[PDB]
């Protein structure tokens, strides 16, 4: 998973994320992080932003 993350980031010409990413769109050239909360979405949203 780290080999995939580094190989993508190195090829496209971007900085590698510090955490382990969950997805990556090829057209956007942007890593994606998925989260499945129970209660409010915005509460879990801004916790990940920190």
């Amino acid at each position: 998973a780290w080999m995939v993350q580094r190989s993508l980031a190195q090829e496209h010409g971007i900085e590698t994320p510090k955490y382990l990413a969950d997805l990556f769109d090829y057209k956007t050239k942007r890593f994606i992080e998925v989260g499945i909360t129970k209660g409010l979405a915005d509460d879990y949203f801004w916790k990940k932003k920190e």
Binding site: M3, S7, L8, Y26
Partner: protein, 733 residues
């Protein structure tokens, strides 16, 4: 006028001229034939020292077990194995009192190391008794056969990565009713020969399969393969040494790592310190005892030596040592450290090849194996061997092995035994008498300092030390040990005389050609000369002569004499052409018949780097061709600095044995070689760094090569076809 070499000692003292008394230029004594006579001596003598204690038949293995621990005290100066538990524990309590957090801190360091330690850590212990094939193999080879064998009986602890689940499977494999495993078997194929009988047994080996019952497997796991020690220095008669299996190795590492952490902190320890750091530590330890000595009293040093070290020391005492040491640690780690002593306590000793019988009248010989050892009248064996086989009877097993509960044969517990030796040194006084002993310990060899008001009390202090050591299972050799006033002594072959004097003859065998290769041995040869100038007291004249004598031995070995010289040979015929072709002759290496530019100042610089500016451009290009076929598969005991040129080559594997065609052996070796090379092609860091992953080795490569294909297509390396062919090949896998 008759010359006398000993008369040198009139003018010069003996420690100053100690190098002369070490005949290391001579040939060391090699063992001939079988080692069964030497092994049986050790088995008899081990039981000889413990026979007064408890005897009982083991219900697990079905073997005669002797137990001298908490046995009757000795009433003579013979070697006693009769150690007393309470006396051992008091010496350890004394150590724990003087060294407070050390017992539990060493346990946690060993414990936390154990948790991080992987299974591949085992593959660096030289020879190991491979229980599958029942002969000694390398640590990596013996481990890999055990991992594959364990998978056949549903034991995939090795797959998890850590050393703990592998060691969990070892103790659980003892409970298994049957043990299926991969083994090797011969193929006795007949051929015509021109030698007496007129035939030839061409043995071909191959990977087969076997099954062993619960009890018979337990014996193999507890077994120690024995053999005679070749090239042993400073001794008349030869002796046997054992080599244990892969099972016990994991547990011994932890017990030794525990005792290592204790030893480092102990002020009177010889191990694990070595070289200059030892010489630093010991000279400090001596300096204290000289200035500790009272005014008018006497400090006396005993040049120590213990007899029958491994044979008297019992595993049951080493079990008690681990139980005391790991007090505050959890129950799982207490149980882990306890396993290694338990296996040694119930061990079995293999007895080598056997004995040869011959008829001089007929001129015929025959090896009798250990299973068929008593299948013959004992009168037909010789007078000395007859007495050994009679004493072996009670401990002898049906499958041609010997039970051996006491002793260690060749005990791996050096560190833990050094702690037990220091434990005796830690008492210092008994009965509040007018003396104070201390010393130095390095497994078997020791050195005891004894401060007191008069020398009559010093000897009584030495007598009290002698007697205290008997209670721990340590027997001081009255024959080999001796004593004198402090100022000079000997310890681990290092001779002291108001300071440690140099001994050049100890390192003299290292000065020759090492046996790796031309490029490496040159770098080694100069480094050995360079180190001995610093440490062993080699002067500049002798250092420069050692340079000269190395190049001579280097040239005669590798057959690479000076190009200008008229020495004929297979290599030399081409060297003479190269000497003519090359302009910058100083640029040529000694391996290509060039001149030796090395001197005292430039021993530390590699030859290729030294001569770089004097080389020709065509010569250096060929010498440093990046993809040359001589430089094989490299991967990052001493180390050296050398440039990887064409002279960095590899020797052939030793396969040509007594008409033994080993095609199938090498097929398995190539099968792993092919898989590992392709993994290194995919993952380039695998040569440098240790790869990690419990997942499949194919899965790592498959997912890697998919991303290689995708990024090559989008960036524009591969065409539209090559990507679709590449993606197709992965779809199958």
């Amino acid at each position: 006028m008759n010359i006398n070499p000993y008369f040198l000692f009139i003018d010069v003292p003996i420690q100053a001229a100690i190098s002369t008394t070490f005949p290391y230029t001579g040939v060391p004594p090699y063992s001939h034939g079988t080692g069964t006579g030497y092994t049986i001596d050790t088995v008899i003598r081990t039981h000889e020292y413990s026979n007064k204690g408890k005897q009982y038949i083991s219900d697990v293995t079905g073997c005669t077990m002797v137990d001298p621990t908490n046995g009757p005290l000795p009433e003579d100066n013979e070697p006693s194995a009769y150690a007393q538990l309470d006396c051992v524990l008091e010496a350890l309590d004394r150590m724990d009192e003087e060294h407070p957090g050390l017992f539990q801190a060493a346990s946690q360091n060993a414990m936390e190391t154990l948790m991080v330690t992987t299974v591949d850590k085992l593959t660096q212990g030289r020879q190991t008794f491979d229980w599958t094939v029942c002969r000694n193999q390398p640590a990596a080879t013996a481990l890999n056969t055990t991992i594959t064998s364990f998978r056949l009986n549903d034991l995939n602890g090795a797959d998890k990565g850590g050393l703990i689940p592998f060691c969990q499977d070892i103790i659980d494999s003892l409970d298994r009713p049957e043990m299926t495993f991969f083994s090797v078997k011969n193929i006795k194929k007949k051929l015509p020969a021109k030698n007496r009988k007129g035939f030839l047994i061409k043995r071909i080996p191959m990977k087969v399969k076997d099954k062993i019952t619960k009890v018979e497997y337990i014996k193999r796991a507890l077994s120690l393969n024995t053999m005679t020690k070749d090239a042993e220095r400073g001794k008349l008669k030869r002796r046997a040494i054992a080599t244990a299996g892969i099972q016990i190795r994991g547990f011994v590492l932890v017990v030794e790592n525990l005792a290592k952490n204790i030893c480092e902190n102990l002020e009177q320890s010889g191990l694990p310190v070595g070289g200059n750091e030892k010489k630093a530590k010991l000279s400090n330890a001596v300096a204290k005892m000289l200035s500790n000595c009272p005014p008018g009293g006497i400090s006396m040093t005993v040049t120590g030596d213990n007899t029958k070290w491994n044979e008297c020391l019992n595993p049951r005492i080493f079990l008690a040592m681990t139980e005391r040491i790991t007090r505050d640690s959890p129950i799982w780690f207490r149980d882990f450290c306890s396993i290694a002593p338990v296996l040694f306590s119930n061990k079995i000793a293999r007895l080598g090849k056997g004995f040869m019988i011959t008829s001089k009248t007929k001129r015929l010989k025959a090896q009798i194996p250990c299973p068929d050892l008593f299948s013959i009248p004992l009168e037909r064996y010789n007078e000395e061997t007859r007495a050994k086989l009679k004493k072996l009877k009670p401990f002898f097993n049906e499958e041609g092995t010997a039970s051996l509960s006491p002793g260690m044969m060749m005990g791996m517990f050096n560190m833990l035994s050094t702690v037990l030796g220091v434990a005796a040194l830690g008492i210092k006084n008994i009965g509040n008498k007018e003396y104070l002993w201390d010393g130095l310990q390095s497994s078997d060899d020791f050195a005891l300092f004894v401060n007191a008001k008069d020398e009559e009390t010093c000897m009584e202090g030495i007598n009290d030390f002698y007697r205290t050591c008997k209670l721990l299972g340590i027997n001081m050799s009255k024959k080999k040990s001796y004593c004198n006033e402090t100022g000079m002594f000997e310890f681990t072959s290092m001779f002291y005389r108001d300071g440690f004097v140099s001994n050049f003859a100890m390192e003299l065998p290292s000065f020759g050609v090492a046996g790796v290769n031309e490029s490496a041995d040159m770098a080694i040869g100069m480094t050995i000369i360079k180190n001995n100038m610093i440490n062993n007291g080699m002067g500049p004249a002798t250092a420069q002569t050692a340079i000269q004598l190395f190049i001579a031995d280097y040239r005669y070995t590798y057959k690479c004499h000076r190009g200008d010289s008229k020495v004929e040979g297979k290599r030399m015929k081409i060297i003479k052409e190269l000497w003519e072709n090359t302009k910058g002759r100083d640029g040529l290496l000694v391996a290509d018949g060039g001149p030796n530019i090395y001197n005292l100042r430039n021993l530390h610089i590699p030859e290729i780097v030294l001569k770089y500016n004097l080389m020709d451009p065509e010569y250096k290009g060929r010498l440093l061709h990046p993809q040359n076929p001589f430089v094989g598969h490299l991967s990052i005991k001493m180390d050296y600095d050398a440039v990887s040129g064409t002279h960095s080559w590899r020797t052939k594997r030793n396969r040509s044995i007594l008409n033994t065609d080993q095609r199938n052996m090498i097929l398995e070796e190539q099968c792993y070689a092919k898989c590992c090379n392709l993994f290194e092609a995919c993952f380039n860091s695998a040569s440098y760094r240790k790869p990690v992953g419990q997942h499949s080795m194919l899965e790592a490569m498959a997912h890697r090569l998919r991303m290689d294909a995708r990024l090559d297509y989008e960036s524009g390396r591969m065409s539209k076809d090559d990507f679709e062919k590449a993606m197709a090949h992965l779809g199958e896998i």
